[PDB]
Amino acid sequence: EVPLPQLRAYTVDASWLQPMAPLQIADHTWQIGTEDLTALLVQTPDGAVLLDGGMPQMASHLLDNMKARGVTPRDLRLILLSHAHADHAGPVAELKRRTGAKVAANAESAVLLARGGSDDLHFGDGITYPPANADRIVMDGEVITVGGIVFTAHFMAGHTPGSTAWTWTDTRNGKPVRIAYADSLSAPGYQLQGNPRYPHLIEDYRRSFATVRALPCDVLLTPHPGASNWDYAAGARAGAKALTCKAYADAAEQKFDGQLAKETAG
Template sequence: MPRVSAVASLLLIAIASPAAAAPPRKAEPALPQLKAYETKEEWRQPVPPFRIGDHTWYVGTAGLSALLVKTDAGAVLIDGGMPQAADMILARMRELGVAPSDLKYILHSHAHADHSGPLAAIQRATGARVVSNAESDALLARGGSADLHFGDEIQFPPLRADRLVLDDEVLELGGMRFTVHFTPGHTPGSMSWTWDDTRNRKPLRIAYVDSLSAPGYHLASNPRYPHIVDDYRRSVDAVRALPCDVLITPHPDASGWTPANTSAPHPQPMTCADYATRAAARLDEQLKAEEAKH
């Protein structure tokens, strides 16, 4: 049997003797808890539904818009708020005489958790068809993950669109015609919607206009969204030209609404042109602030 060298013998002893190893490491602290997506209380505060037009109702919360449009052929829901709002929206529909099977279409503004959060649950409960565009459908399918600006911070139950629309396409139900206007910027797939209603039998042009804000976004030379500033500017111009007797936005306070005061929920009406002008000014200010940091 061949002789084992002294060095090899020492190695064998070290490997075979755990007691000779380094002292045990001190236990590391547990990984931090994942923080839930926290929101303002008003975003989660129910308010009684109130009428905007003869066919159009506000069914959202104090701080997040959701609209229900009733027609002779069924109803249309636009946005829903946070994921936990699904049961509230369904209850509001029933209060207004709309059974789950009466909801035919679900439209939306953009695919963030605070507006599209409950849409998957509402779709399952009603069988309604979800209408979106190609950009938003991709984000809806991911449940908001891999967002260009927020990463995986604001996820929601995923869903897929049943119908994809193009810019200026019209969706018709029961004599009501909903026109989609692509207004990218806040997300690449952001959409605004216009339709004609009446109030006290007088014509009323309603515009549900998506957010034109850029909360904490990196705007100049953004490698993931190189044309974000150009998109914002085009969207501002598009919003300025919309038919717009009544403006409503996904965050109602952005267009002068206070839904918690249902007896007088619109104390400071704003035109689409004013909304666009203010958005353009904020965009310019944000760009200047970015330039000042570099």
């Protein structure tokens, strides 16, 4: 006689959980997460912004890296998200408790964050994390400005209903750098065709490929750095092989078409 299985925690490659020192992207923008999960700090004369936090166990490391940059808990004003999965939104509830930060997100991301990633359209209750509340709801194309850095929301539904690309302009050498933080365009283990929980999944991904291709995009970063060919452990050469937004969208679409064909075959 056989009991119900124990709960299984989601495990990840060690590199996803490997702390790294701050890596500078542009004049006010730094990578502060791990070797394989993006967490972007944008530092301004009127406070700081964090774009994603990575996994639940990353909160204290993020705070250490902020302190190393001169950003205190009180100085962190805003958290934005690519999407509200456990591997990017994991420590948001904890960061809100330990800092001044408020969360801005679209309605879809807010609803999923408030459930802590439970009842996911594809993963069910498999990838839960501590729930958090959004403080501000944003619409597509809406701008948020901190210390004169202007963040623009570009909805790119598919990976999650609330998937968002965030764009802003920083500087390097007195010249503008148009940075695009584009969300994931994967469909890990998804049923794509005839999905009752997401009937227009395929059209949404198609529109999202087009949205990504057209972003203002001098430098592309992604929540999993490998997707845009970043190597954060490579120091001075981390971003050398980085894809354009055009090439990232094309590769994602080619992968997606292959997955659709494998699904029809299966």
